[PDB]
Amino acid sequence: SLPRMVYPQPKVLTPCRKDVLVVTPWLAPIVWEGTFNIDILNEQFRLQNTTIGLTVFAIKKYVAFLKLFLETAEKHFMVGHRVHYYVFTDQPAAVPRVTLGTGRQLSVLEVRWQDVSMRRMEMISDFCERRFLSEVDYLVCVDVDMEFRDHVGVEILTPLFGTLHPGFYGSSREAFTYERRPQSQAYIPKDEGDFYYGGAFFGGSVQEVQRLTRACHQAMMVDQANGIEAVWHDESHLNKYLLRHKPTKVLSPEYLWDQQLLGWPAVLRKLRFTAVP
Numbered sequence: 001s002l003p004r005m006v007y008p009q010p011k012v013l014t015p016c017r018k019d020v021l022v023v024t025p026w027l028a029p030i031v032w033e034g035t036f037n038i039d040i041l042n043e044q045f046r047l048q049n050t051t052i053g054l055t056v057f058a059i060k061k062y063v064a065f066l067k068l069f070l071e072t073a074e075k076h077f078m079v080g081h082r083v084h085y086y087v088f089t090d091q092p093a094a095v096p097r098v099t100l101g102t103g104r105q106l107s108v109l110e111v112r113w114q115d116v117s118m119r120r121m122e123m124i125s126d127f128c129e130r131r132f133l134s135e136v137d138y139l140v141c142v143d144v145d146m147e148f149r150d151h152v153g154v155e156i157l158t159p160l161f162g163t164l165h166p167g168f169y170g171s172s173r174e175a176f177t178y179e180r181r182p183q184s185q186a187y188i189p190k191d192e193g194d195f196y197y198g199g200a201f202f203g204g205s206v207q208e209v210q211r212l213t214r215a216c217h218q219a220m221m222v223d224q225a226n227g228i229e230a231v232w233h234d235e236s237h238l239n240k241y242l243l244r245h246k247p248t249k250v251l252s253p254e255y256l257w258d259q260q261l262l263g264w265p266a267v268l269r270k271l272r273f274t275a276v277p
């Protein structure tokens, strides 16, 4: 049961946003600033003692991105909630010693180009079946060459989410860079597709993330056996999976942005998680 809370009444005959789609045709919320009251959501998730896992891969020179990634996650990611960072790396000694807030912990997990391509999906799936099931409620899987600039919180949490890729949120489906060769397991025809989801930010419950990552891994191994590599690698497979298994929330491009390449459009009230230039 929620406690008494004082907040503005939601107004039925006033839309929350007039400039963007805030719900998908399968009734999944599309998360934009102005659609949620974070105080209500924080209450709901704190009362469940929610723990969020955040996975990141930092292989070879990408260890250089960890310090800013983690420092900014400390400022902006799930603050007030239990967080477990999982840093997958080939260089455990190169992981910076970042000071964490209370209730937050970090684990370092030591890790043919074909095997490198399948690595993230394979390892996330393997670790879902081990550590993650026992340790966290939700998993968030992101790229490391990024920084948090504003709030990323429990508004994203749901059984399965994808994020609108910042390059294609205003594009027609024919222009999406899905895999277009029927010989690939990631194939999507020109007349199908809801959104182009970014491989750099997805997640959900541990069970749903295990299913997604196992399915993507298995599809990639079928492609490898057939001598084909999808145009955008595991992102192509992620898009095929989310076409056939609709996400229960979609995050707006506030949650995955590149200001150098795309500026700061009026439609984005906040830039929350952004590419490092």
Ligand SMILES: O=C(NC[C@H]1O[C@@H](n2ccc(=O)[nH]c2=O)[C@H](O)[C@@H]1O)[C@@H](CO)n1cc(-c2ccccc2)nn1
Pocket: 056, 057, 058, 059, 060, 061, 062, 113, 114, 116, 117, 118, 142, 143, 144, 145, 232, 233, 234
């Ligand atoms: O590299 C990719 N995304 C960036 C993230 O992948 C991780 N990464 C990438 C390169 C690298 O050297 N180290 C590393 O950690 C890091 O977390 C980056 O944020 C995507 C882009 O398509 N990618 C490339 C490939 C790939 C793998 C093997 C062969 C060809 C492509 N798979 N995924």
Ligand SMILES: CCCCCCCCO[C@@H]1O[C@H](CO)[C@H](O)[C@H](O)[C@H]1O[C@@H]1O[C@@H](C)[C@@H](O)[C@@H](O)[C@@H]1O
Pocket: 165, 166, 167, 168, 177, 198, 199, 232, 235, 257, 258, 261, 275
């Ligand atoms: C029509 C408008 C034309 C403009 C489109 C501009 C975005 C293109 O984006 C690339 O999209 C690819 C899929 O098609 C992959 O997701 C790739 O990782 C991504 O590059 C990434 O994300 C970008 C945002 C940059 O940060 C880039 O450095 C990344 O490597």
